[PDB]
């Protein structure tokens, strides 16, 4: 892939029933808690976390790279105060795809203060195919897909220096 063209496929403001405004000190911005910019951390809005549902027909004219995530809490109380229910799921589905993650609340070593983890997965969505997210807990939804704008022989060099 020689060039990506970012597309807003599942805009953050659509999530009218959940809290789209997460964050942590681990993703800090100016000392203030932030998060990944292309990701949305759907949490509960006042007690409830109803079924989160998302969809996108790939009408952008090329294959599209899409990333999503599930959140693995530390204790049960994290789980309840973030998603209300225990025992949730995070289904993603296309035509080549049918993944249904279910979350693993379990204590762990503090990386960046956090004994909790986000597990991220990914797919290519073919032209005119349709991606569906449905969850009742722990989804970290995408906001964007990347469209493959330029294809060609490229590479990734593992250098630790800079360009002249």
């Amino acid at each position, epitope marked *: 892939v020689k060039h990506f063209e970012k597309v807003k496929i599942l805009p953050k403001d659509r999530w*009218t*029933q959940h*809290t789209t*405004t*997460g*964050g*942590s*000190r681990a993703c800090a911005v100016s000392g*203030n*808690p932030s998060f990944f910019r292309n990701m949305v951390w759907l*949490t*509960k*809005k*006042g*007690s*409830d976390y109803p079924v989160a549902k998302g969809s996108y027909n790939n009408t952008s004219g090329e294959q599209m790279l899409i990333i999503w995530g599930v959140h693995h809490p530390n204790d049960e*109380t*994290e789980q*309840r*105060t*973030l998603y209300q229910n225990v025992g949730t799921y995070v289904s993603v589905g296309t035509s080549t795809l049918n993944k249904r993650s279910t979350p693993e609340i379990a204590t762990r070593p503090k990386v960046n203060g956090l004994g909790s983890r986000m597990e991220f997965s990914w797919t290519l969505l073919d032209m005119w195919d349709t991606i569906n997210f449905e969850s009742t807990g722990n989804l970290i939804a995408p906001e964007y897909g990347f469209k493959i704008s330029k294809r060609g022989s490229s590479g990734i060099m593992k250098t630790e220096g800079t360009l002249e």
Partner: antibody
Amino acid sequence: EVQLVESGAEVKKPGSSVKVSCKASGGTFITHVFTWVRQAPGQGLEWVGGFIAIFGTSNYAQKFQGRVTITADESTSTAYMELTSLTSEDTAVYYCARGISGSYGWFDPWGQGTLVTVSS
Amino acid sequence: DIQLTQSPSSLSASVGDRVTITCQASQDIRKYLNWYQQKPGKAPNLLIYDASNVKTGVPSRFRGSGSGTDFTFTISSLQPEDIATYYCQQYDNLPITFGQGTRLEIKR
């Protein structure tokens, strides 16, 4: 039964600043969201802002920007509202109340309030 | 910002009467609407959350209704310890707003 213990009453001269407290007692820390609603004598209810334990993020009402600053202390399960450049319009009772979720739920329980009185 | 516009501004009613109060919103706020009571001298107190839900220990006579932009709060039979001001509040959006409040007195 989660209880709320909020700081004593203050009389401050104008242009100074106040910092009020809310210790949340009877439940675990990160399930907490702290919110502050002020209320002037005779008028009614006005949101100041609040703080979400689980994300450590604070929210202000744009009315107060620059002056209000919210923090917390997990050791104490104690949150803090600090209003600066106080004018006599800031005189009100300042209730702390516990809400729910990142969207500030409903507010229960409410503390009994901290009378701040701004007067030269 | 979302305007919560509560009517009537005051309400004299006899005891045993049913009182209804309304709270209208500048926007669709789904059922993201709660209802407070502030008796004179006391702190506000939650009576109803998510438009229709009644907090435990609130007596039966309090009911909450309303779904989109218009909301209704009803005491079925006014009881002399109900005279207070009542507030509504919204989440959904975020600068968190209250109504201006509705004052319950008794008709004599």
